[PDB]
Design a protein around this ligand. Structure first.
Ligand SMILES: Cc1cc2nc3c(=O)[nH]c(=O)nc-3n(C[C@H](O)[C@H](O)[C@H](O)COP(=O)(O)O)c2cc1C
Ligand SMILES: Cc1cc2nc3c(=O)[nH]c(=O)nc-3n(C[C@H](O)[C@H](O)[C@H](O)COP(=O)(O)O)c2cc1C
Ligand SMILES: [Cl-]
Ligand SMILES: [Cl-]
Lengths: 122, 122
């Protein structure tokens, strides 16, 4: 599900954005490119310190969107690219998906996104 | 209302994320930090090439969220910061707000976000 160009983006620095659906509109939070941990089976794991509103949204609607990119990875028509990822999210406080990001001692949980599609948008 | 630290983030490269309310959940698109033009009266202007789905969403619900950041600008508790911006959006196709981004020869419109709040989230 995740292409090589996505893994090239993860070798570079940047701001990741994660959109969820809430009762009165979308919500949008961040992490860093370097914090994402990709697992077998199309999973992207994010260390969670805050994400309280995000977690409440995900408990009611698991579908999330994530974007990320880098000036330093070539896109289709010149330098710079990024991705729109769609997937289903879950929060974990134990098990191997939590252990994947437990090195971040500030992490109360892991946000685990099981990818359904990845689109290179540039 | 946009603070100095936000303009510091704009001196740096990065991926900007813009969330809108879609018919069946959020939508999320991107631009680059360096593409944003800030005008007086709390306005952030983005060059629009695609964004047809985003534009349809804004016509139904003008409220948008935007995030952006940089590893190179100090946050409250170490290196790296970013912002959550909430505002209302409109799409201009002539006049000073369009001229503000017309340097992008591929632009079909200017996305004008009038900022209601800016929160440094790191
Ligand atoms: C560049 C950047 C990176 C961030 N990294 C994280 C992160 O890895 N994990 C986290 O929980 N919050 C991180 N934050 C803060 C979140 O974006 C968010 O503001 C916070 O978790 C509160 O989430 P909520 O609004 O869903 O309650 C980061 C913020 C920025 C601007
Ligand atoms: C890093 C990055 C920068 C982008 N810059 C722009 C931009 O400045 N303007 C634009 O219209 N689309 C830009 N795109 C593409 C949009 O994110 C989006 O995929 C496209 O405009 C289609 O919008 P829509 O899904 O609302 O129809 C960029 C994509 C990436 C990954
Ligand atoms: Cl990073
Ligand atoms: Cl940039």
């Amino acid at each position: 599900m995740l292409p090589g160009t996505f893994f090239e983006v993860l070798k570079n620095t940047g701001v990741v954005a994660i959109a969820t659906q809430g009762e009165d509109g979308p919500h949008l939070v961040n992490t860093w490119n370097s914090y994402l941990k990709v697992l077998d089976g199309n999973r992207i794991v994010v260390p969670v310190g805050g994400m309280h509103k995000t977690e409440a949204n995900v408990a009611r609607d698991e579908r999330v969107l994530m974007t990320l990119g880098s000036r330093k990875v070539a896109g289709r028509n010149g330098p710079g690219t990024g991705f729109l990822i769609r997937g289903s999210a879950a929060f974990r406080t134990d098990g191997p998906e939590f252990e994947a990001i437990a090195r971040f001692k500030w992490a109360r949980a892991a946000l685990v996104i099981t990818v359904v599609s990845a689109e290179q948008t540039l």
